[PDB]
Design a protein around this ligand. Structure first.
Ligand code: NA
Ligand code: NA
Ligand code: NA
Ligand SMILES: [Zn+2]
Length: 76
């Protein structure tokens, strides 16, 4: 019952949505690596990026907003 990436289906990942100012893919990755996180698949989202991190990680990156992505969303 391992957590699986919402991007790729691979087990061992939790997909987050990342947003931030002048956020680019290299900057995002660099900021995560700077927190000592293993980074899995990263892909562009609408308004930011999706990024896979290990389920056990507790990502708090300054100025950067990271929330777990949901598999589905409603019309709110
Ligand atoms: Na399995
Ligand atoms: Na684009
Ligand atoms: Na765009
Ligand atoms: Zn857009």
């Amino acid at each position: 019952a391992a957590e699986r990436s919402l991007l790729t289906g691979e087990e061992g990942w939790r997909t987050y949505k990342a947003t931030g100012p002048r956020l680019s893919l290299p900057r995002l990755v660099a900021l995560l690596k700077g927190q000592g996180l293993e980074v899995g698949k990263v892909a562009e989202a609408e308004g930011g990026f999706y990024v896979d991190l290990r389920p056990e990680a507790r990502p708090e990156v300054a100025g950067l907003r990271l929330e777990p992505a949901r598999r589905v969303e409603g019309l709110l």
